[PDB]
Amino acid sequence: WXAXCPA
Amino acid sequence: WXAXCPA
Amino acid sequence: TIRKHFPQFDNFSPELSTVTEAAKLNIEAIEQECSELIRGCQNLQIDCDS
Amino acid sequence: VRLIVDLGGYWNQRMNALKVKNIIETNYENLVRQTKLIGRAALELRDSKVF
Amino acid sequence: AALVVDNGSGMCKAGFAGDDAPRAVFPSIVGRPRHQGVMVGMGQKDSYVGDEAQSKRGILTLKYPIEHGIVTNWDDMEKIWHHTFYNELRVAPEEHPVLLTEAPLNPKANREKMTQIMFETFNTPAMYVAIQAVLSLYASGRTTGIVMDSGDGVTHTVPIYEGYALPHAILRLDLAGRDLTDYLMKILTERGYSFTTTAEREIVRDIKEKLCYVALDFEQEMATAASSSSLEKSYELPDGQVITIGNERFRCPEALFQPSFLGMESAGIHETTFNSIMKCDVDIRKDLYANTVLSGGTTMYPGIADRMQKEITALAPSTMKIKIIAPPERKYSVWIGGSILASLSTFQQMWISKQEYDESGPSIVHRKCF
Amino acid sequence: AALVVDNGSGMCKAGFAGDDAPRAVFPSIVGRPRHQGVMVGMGQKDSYVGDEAQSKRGILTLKYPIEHGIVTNWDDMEKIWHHTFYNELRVAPEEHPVLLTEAPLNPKANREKMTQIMFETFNTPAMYVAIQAVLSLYASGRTTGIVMDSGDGVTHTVPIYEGYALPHAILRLDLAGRDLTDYLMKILTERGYSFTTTAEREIVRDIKEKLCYVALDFEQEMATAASSSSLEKSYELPDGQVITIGNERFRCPEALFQPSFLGMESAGIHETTFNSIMKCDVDIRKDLYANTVLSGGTTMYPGIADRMQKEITALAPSTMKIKIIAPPERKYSVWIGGSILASLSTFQQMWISKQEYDESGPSIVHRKCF
Numbered sequence: 065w066x067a068x069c070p071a
Numbered sequence: 072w073x074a075x076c077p078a
Numbered sequence: 079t080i081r082k083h084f085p086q087f088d089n090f091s092p093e094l095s096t097v098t099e100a101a102k103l104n105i106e107a108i109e110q111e112c113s114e115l116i117r118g119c120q121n122l123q124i125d126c127d128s
Numbered sequence: 129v130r131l132i133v134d135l136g137g138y139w140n141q142r143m144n145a146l147k148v149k150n151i152i153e154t155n156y157e158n159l160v161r162q163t164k165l166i167g168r169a170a171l172e173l174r175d176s177k178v179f
Numbered sequence: 180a181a182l183v184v185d186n187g188s189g190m191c192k193a194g195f196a197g198d199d200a201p202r203a204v205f206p207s208i209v210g211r212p213r214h215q216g217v218m219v220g221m222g223q224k225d226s227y228v229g230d231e232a233q234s235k236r237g238i239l240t241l242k243y244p245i246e247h248g249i250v251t252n253w254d255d256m257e258k259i260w261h262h263t264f265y266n267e268l269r270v271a272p273e274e275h276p277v278l279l280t281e282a283p284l285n286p287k288a289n290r291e292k293m294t295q296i297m298f299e300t301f302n303t304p305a306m307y308v309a310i311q312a313v314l315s316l317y318a319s320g321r322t323t324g325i326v327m328d329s330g331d332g333v334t335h336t337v338p339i340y341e342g343y344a345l346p347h348a349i350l351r352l353d354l355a356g357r358d359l360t361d362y363l364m365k366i367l368t369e370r371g372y373s374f375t376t377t378a379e380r381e382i383v384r385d386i387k388e389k390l391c392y393v394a395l396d397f398e399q400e401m402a403t404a405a406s407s408s409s410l411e412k413s414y415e416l417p418d419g420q421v422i423t424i425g426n427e428r429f430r431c432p433e434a435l436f437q438p439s440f441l442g443m444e445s446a447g448i449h450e451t452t453f454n455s456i457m458k459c460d461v462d463i464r465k466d467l468y469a470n471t472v473l474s475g476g477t478t479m480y481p482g483i484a485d486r487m488q489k490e491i492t493a494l495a496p497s498t499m500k501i502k503i504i505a506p507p508e509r510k511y512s513v514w515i516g517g518s519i520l521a522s523l524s525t526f527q528q529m530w531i532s533k534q535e536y537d538e539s540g541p542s543i544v545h546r547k548c549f
Numbered sequence: 550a551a552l553v554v555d556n557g558s559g560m561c562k563a564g565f566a567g568d569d570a571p572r573a574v575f576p577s578i579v580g581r582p583r584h585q586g587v588m589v590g591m592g593q594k595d596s597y598v599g600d601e602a603q604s605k606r607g608i609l610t611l612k613y614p615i616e617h618g619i620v621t622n623w624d625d626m627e628k629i630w631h632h633t634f635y636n637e638l639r640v641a642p643e644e645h646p647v648l649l650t651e652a653p654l655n656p657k658a659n660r661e662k663m664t665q666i667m668f669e670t671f672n673t674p675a676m677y678v679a680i681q682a683v684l685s686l687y688a689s690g691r692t693t694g695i696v697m698d699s700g701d702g703v704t705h706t707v708p709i710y711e712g713y714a715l716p717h718a719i720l721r722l723d724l725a726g727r728d729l730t731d732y733l734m735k736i737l738t739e740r741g742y743s744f745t746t747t748a749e750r751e752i753v754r755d756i757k758e759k760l761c762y763v764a765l766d767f768e769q770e771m772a773t774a775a776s777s778s779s780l781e782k783s784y785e786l787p788d789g790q791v792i793t794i795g796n797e798r799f800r801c802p803e804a805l806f807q808p809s810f811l812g813m814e815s816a817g818i819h820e821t822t823f824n825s826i827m828k829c830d831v832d833i834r835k836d837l838y839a840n841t842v843l844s845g846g847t848t849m850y851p852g853i854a855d856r857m858q859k860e861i862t863a864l865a866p867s868t869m870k871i872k873i874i875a876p877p878e879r880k881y882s883v884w885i886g887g888s889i890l891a892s893l894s895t896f897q898q899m900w901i902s903k904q905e906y907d908e909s910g911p912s913i914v915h916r917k918c919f
């Protein structure tokens with residue numbers, strides 16, 4: 065993800 | 072709650 | 079039938095839109111509400127003057 | 129005692145005067161719009177050849 | 180002096196009678212550190228309460244002891260009360276009566292336990308239990324009106340015509356800001372931002388308080404948002420990353436009036452107002468229309484009153500006039516009204532005595548308080 | 550064979566003339582799914598009614614087409630009737646006369662409205678409409694009396710006499726089963742159970758039908774209920790949860806006798822029964838007292854008969870005798886009485902034919918069957 069996690 | 076919802 | 083041989087009557091909703099708004103309005107209460115104002119103000123005139 | 133008992137002779141009439149003035153200051157303008165709306169609709173339907 | 184404490188689902192305040200502003204302002208959360216202590220230099224307390232937790236909220240398991248206005252965890256609840264009286268308010272409870280506020284339509288077990296705690300843990304000289312929403316109307320200087328309270332766990336509508344409210348027309352809805360916080364995040368995942376833990380939930384809480392707003396026309400606004408730009412705003416995360424949000428600015432606050440997006444069959448907040456006023460008498464209906472009052476931190480959204488006034492206007496017949504009152508400081512109306520009520524001399528006789536509690540146990544609260 | 554169809558606010562009853570029990574007894578509900586369907590190829594219907602709607606009620610938004618007696622939706626009302634004939638009864642209406650019932654003091658607007666939708670959509674060969682209250686005592690085997698008609702939508706008190714209704718003496722009271730079910734939930738939350746949605750509105754309807762009962766003395770029973778746990782009973786929720794109610798068994802049904810508990814200025818049926826009989830003639834008043842009858846599913850509560858007998862006795866003069874007739878089959882009394890009326894040989898006289906309607910039009914019903 066863009067904000068939060070890596071994805 | 073007890074019977075219903077989470078409370 | 080209308081949308082086949084009567085193009086002039088294709089959609090009468092847009093041409094008559096004030097009737098829809100007036101349907102939500104209750105006529106009898108409107109006269110009752112306003113006519114009370116004439117009653118109250120006329121009672122004020124005698125109350126203030128006499 | 130200084131307001132209700134003291135002025136009970138004309139208190140209600142003074143209150144009767146104030147309530148109407150505030151009422152007129154508020155409802156009068158929208159009443160005119162409501163009347164102008166209903167009369168216009170009646171004229172519109174009477175003057176509609178499509179209907 | 181008499182102390183005023185207003186326990187809320189997420190936000191709890193406390194102060195003194197006659198004051199115009201609550202003394203203590205800190206959220207009501209207790210967290211426990213999941214990780215294991217490595218360093219022994221500092222205290223590293225077992226638990227932290229209030230503003231202490233949020234400062235270190237990254238490493239705590241934040242828990243809300245009260246849910247939907249119901250204290251689920253009583254063990255944690257006394258930790259707040261102990262913290263309020265000794266750390267924030269730094270006063271001894273056994274010299275002053277204290278008043279607590281509750282939502283209407285609560286379980287009888289909720290408000291019997293607090294009275295037991297007050298007269299056994301803190302040994303307060305006196306106590307009182309007063310509905311949250313009714314005190315809000317006192318802050319507006321009115322006694323004939325309907326109060327729209329909307330906090331974090333409860334969204335209750337109550338009409339009040341005289342010094343006491345009508346219990347029969349009280350409509351309580353469990354749709355509030357905390358449900359809204361759960362709602363933007365699932366929608367926010369559409370834009371590529373993932374927030375799951377409770378620590379980032381307060382970060383989620385912040386963006387709602389600053390960027391969310393009520394749209395007057397949801398259908399027209401979403402069409403406007405389809406053209407892109409002119410609505411997206413940039414917000415900086417505590418990490419440092421800057422996020423941009425489009426249509427979601429109005430979509431989440433819109434869910435109040437269309438609960439179909441959240442999956443519960445109850446009608447919108449605009450509609451339940453109409454239902455409650457239908458349950459009262461015809462003559463009292465005229466007064467309540469012109470005396471509609473909003474309260475609670477949820478009602479802070481810009482333009483919420485304007486859209487609310489439009490919605491009720493369509494449902495209500497055009498004869499009666501609708502005026503929505505939105506005082507600027509309606510955030511603390513519940514506490515402020517309590518300060519006025521506590522300051523009243525007539526209220527010295529509606530206090531509950533410690534001796535009276537002893538004779539009747541904790542069951543006296545049903546009969547005396549309301 | 551003449552069909553006898555009993556449209557009701559809660560339950561819909563249908564069968565055949567001469568039968569001792571309705572053939573199909575299914576709820577009068579209409580359901581429309583609130584969620585989109587993702588599993589294709591099933592042929593899922595658009596609208597669901599009756600038992601099938603009740604079976605899948607969790608994912609449906611149930612609506613009552615009839616509320617407070619007046620039909621608020623004429624489009625759904627035919628659908629349940631359409632399901633009534635072809636699905637539940639599996640009989641073609643083209644070759645059978647059908648019997649429907651009408652409510653006391655019904656507005657004239659509806660009466661041709663059912664007429665104009667039956668002779669056209671289903672083209673039934675013959676028709677007749679009578680009062681459900683009149684058919685109540687017909688099943689009881691008497692022709693003169695007063696009926697304590699209570700149901701899901703409305704309640705009426707009709708002092709019938711030789712089977713001819715008295716319009717001026719008809720009293721309408723808004724204390725129906727739906728009100729009690731709505732009152733049961735607002736008082737059930739005191740024990741921590743929160744039922745709000747419409748799907749679970751049937752659940753409390755199931756609970757009160759099995760557990761609620763009428764207490765002879767309210768003041769004595771609350772004292773005993775508080776003192777001992779004997780009155781408490783355990784009920785099982787469909788999810789497996791176990792609930793217990795202590796005093797709500799006798800409290801919800803008591804509102805039928807104390808409407809101020811709901812906040813209605815109109816008083817209970819016990820005085821309304823006495824109020825109605827005050828309007829009749831003095832000479833006939835002797836007969837009406839001794840042939841009072843109870844009807845409808847609302848009057849199913851245990852111990853309801855002796856309680857009303859005790860109360861109206863104090864209201865009634867000491868000289869008069871009161872005989873409360875409560876047949877155990879009074880649940881289907883309205884349906885059974887219609888089957889009795891249809892089976893009569895002389896009942897062919899006041900048929901309204903399809904041909905005669907054509908020249909007479911919708912207005913014939915007001916004068917033919919009155």
Ligand SMILES: Nc1ncnc2c1ncn2[C@@H]1O[C@H](COP(=O)(O)OP(=O)(O)O)[C@@H](O)[C@H]1O
Nearest residue numbers: 187188189190330331356387388475476477479
């Ligand atoms: N500026 C704001 N805009 C939108 N919502 C806000 C704002 N400030 C506070 N809130 C909401 O109000 C809620 C708390 O309001 P309040 O009723 O004062 O406390 P509680 O709900 O705990 O009683 C918070 O959960 C927050 O989401």
Ligand SMILES: Nc1ncnc2c1ncn2[C@@H]1O[C@H](COP(=O)(O)OP(=O)(O)O)[C@@H](O)[C@H]1O
Nearest residue numbers: 557558559560700701726757758845846847849
């Ligand atoms: N054993 C029972 N105890 C309590 N209430 C009952 C019982 N059986 C049925 N009822 C109630 O009676 C209602 C049935 O109403 P009904 O008589 O069918 O209305 P109508 O007379 O309009 O057809 C249901 O809503 C149900 O709540």
Ligand SMILES: [Mg+2]
Nearest residue numbers: 187330331475
């Ligand atoms: Mg609050």
Ligand SMILES: [Mg+2]
Nearest residue numbers: 681699700845
């Ligand atoms: Mg009935």
